[model samples]
Target: PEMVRGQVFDVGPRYTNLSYIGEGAYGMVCSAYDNLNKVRVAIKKISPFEHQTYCQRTLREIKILLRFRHENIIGINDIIRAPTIEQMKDVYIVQDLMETDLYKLLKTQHLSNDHICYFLYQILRGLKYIHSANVLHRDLKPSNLLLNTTCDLKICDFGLARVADPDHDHTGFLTEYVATRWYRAPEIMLNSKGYTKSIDIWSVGCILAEMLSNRPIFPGKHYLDQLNHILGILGSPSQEDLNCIINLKARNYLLSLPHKNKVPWNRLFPNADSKALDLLDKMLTFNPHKRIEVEQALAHPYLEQYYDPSDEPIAEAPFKFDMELDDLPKEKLKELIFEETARFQP
Candidate 1:
């Protein structure tokens, strides 16, 4: 813990820099020692107020991470408080130092059926927790899933998470922009009324496929190509299902395409366990309504050995944020972010 890397992370005096971790497009991370916890941790430094959008995202990430406490979800030990609301700059939050992320691990790892099943199980378990909290993880990809060498996975990075009003009384009017194209759900692109929890489920399906073959299940050159990749495997939806598309152009595009039969799961994943393929098919169903729910997916025979009702925990209470995350402005978001950090300190 005493070893300090070349870059100095002046987060606070209590946390000593250990080594430089990697950087994302917007933030920098570094290994550090948490004097209070007396263990090494990863400190992610983010400047939240550069723009209104970033400010809102940072607010969402801080609030969601603060409320979440699950084995499968990443935990924040503390949010280093800004010096003062009047003169705030960079904000830092402490996290567990993981060995690597799922994206990096998948590049060269020799995974067996056991690896795919266990990994998929953990992703579903974590998604259940997040969904239970009434939050939609709009951005879910291999890079966001952190990994430990022992096969322990923790879902991280909640910048795009939004608190959803789960009651079906009103149309779930969610924004169209979410997730990387490869992992995005068809409903997110086609359904005009908005979306549901199944959005995250589709990404999980994509991740499971990636693990089975060690390549992106849907490696699309663009969004249009991404949809084609999906249809190429799953087949075009039935006429009734095709009507669900809100946009006339989208509907016409499907009608114009050559009819393709659904590729049998066994044919695509010939070497995979039959049980695993069955679950994969259910998860990747073209109709979001027909797709398996997280609890149902966990109970699938593929993950039977690992499914323990008592062990796969749900959030005791819903994580209610102060306001609509995507709608909040910079000044209010800045206050919320600072207030969240203030609560962690004495």
Candidate 2:
């Protein structure tokens, strides 16, 4: 294949820039056309690995994207590395380009019941695949959810994701800080210990509510206030729920907070379908264990007609990375990228 060079990054000549798209988790993204593939693509130009945290995040994101293959998950077409060490300032990830994201799409149009059901069905479908593979998309928000004119949705951004080891034994301890503030689950905001895959379910609930209301259900000023916002609507958790908080500090913190009365769902989403509202109630439940699972959510009456049992699951883990890369130098980081490119290259 022929190669082309851009001012900021280089890729095969088969791909030409259409326009600058926007910023991504690590750097700028742009819309480009792939002559070989004969289709439009989104190329993410990630900055050089100046920070180890970013380096690990980039690697993890690549691993997660490469591992999953589903209609509802974003696909990676190519991994473009700098031609020479001296020129190794950025890495380009070529993937399918969409018209807009859920965030932007929500602003421009009014959604009908069919639109809500299909959009939400696809989200749950993707989550089902991801969760079945023992993966957790810790970052699930509007911007991370891409959309096209067809209203087809794909989940992106895996920098904060982790392989779900409910036992917390294989993955070690997971971090408390994950997901955007508005979409964050109470367990994460409260720093609860050993959170399960239910974290993503909580986000699904938040996104569903936003789609129906055209506004974030819990738009908090900060983490503390995020908890407040949730409580303000959902009310204080039962003592049994508080007991589920294994972390001493987190449990005590909840105990000290002012109590609240549960707000009726009718008041929050008066116009939503009764079935949709019922599913939302189950998904947004305060107890992580009680939060609706992806399978259950998909089978809910809200989406029962669209449910498909044929959705395939990953047979085994598809990618692996060295956690030590989080502390390695840039030179080692370059080697990491080289190995990853070799795995994907024809």
Candidate 3:
């Protein structure tokens, strides 16, 4: 809501604001009631004019978010925009609201094994769906994961996501500098060009470890520091593993670092059970090929009692984009967004 000419004005007729939630990558987020749905929802208002790259990313995110439908993934309730094309400046994305994000929740309380298992289960389930769609959630982190009082977790934020192509023909220009520093994968930190979906598995491992210890496993201040932290704990990459790294500079740099012994998993997670540690070990593995798959992680013994086979994602065709927009000009980008907006029913 805003005040205009000494008059109080509601933000819109569809939803009324109660309080400001917080700022997101796109814009200000607020809790509001959806008059049509008769339910509470979070409204993320994004301004395309803020940044040209942001404008393109927002469009890509919306295209992907709208196509996904799963309990573990955040739901899109509505997309509100100005009626006229010329008046379009802000995009209001309405979705089911959660109480807080994982980053904030973990800061206040310690989670039990049961809670951790269930949280990891849901996150993996959500990733299964996203990955099945051939998308890499490059910006995954605790804050990007939303939570409800019931402990339900959902993955959010797709602005940095890119369509994962096995051929690697189209994604050549995708930025490697994504994901929060602590949760970033080794391949990305080393500036590898041919990273795969395993990067997300590494991030999940970092998040799982953080949930266990209440602190980041690798709290690095910079890329070099991050790589050093990883090496300090996991030790230097095996000669064979180093040989597989696509980035020669990164491989050479790893060889230059002092030899460090690998830390035992049990030592790092003293209180964690064997099954939990096993899954974490697989996830935190330095080699991308050796990282745990979403399907395998879902079936790991640690989550056996809590796992539901029915929750696994069924085979579905991945989303397809006819054209690349990474270098599209601002005017053309705006036009693309408007075209997509007109077609978006959500």
Task: For candidate 3, give the lDDT.
Answer: 0.79
Q: Could you give candidate 2's per-residue lDDT for residues 104-164 as a string of tens digits?
A: 8778777788889999999999888888777778878888899887788998887777776
> What lDDT does candidate 3 reach at residue 74?
90
Error of 2 at 170 (Å): 14
Candidate 2's error at 175, in angstroms?
9.0
**lDDT (Cα, 0-100) at 312 in candidate 2:** 33
Task: List model 3 lDDT by residue over 70-122, tens digit each.
Answer: 88889777787876668777787888899888899889889899988999999
Residue 50 of model 3, lDDT score = 51
lDDT per residue, candidate 1, 1-346, as tens digits?
A: 1233454356667887557778854577888777878888888878768688888778878778877899888888878755688877777778898888889988989689888888888888899898888888877899999988698999988888766643531232233546788988876665432236777888888888888888998898976577778988998789977766556766776788889999998888788898988898888988776789999999999999899978888888896653566566788888888888887766
lDDT score of residue 249 within candidate 1: 62
How much does candidate 3 score in TM-score? 0.92
Q: Candidate 2: what lDDT?
A: 0.78
As for candidate 3, its clashing pairs are none
What ranges in model 2 sit over 4 Å off?
Answer: 1-7, 83-87, 169-175, 193-195, 312-325, 343-346
The alpha-carbon lDDT assigned to residue 101 of candidate 2 equals: 89
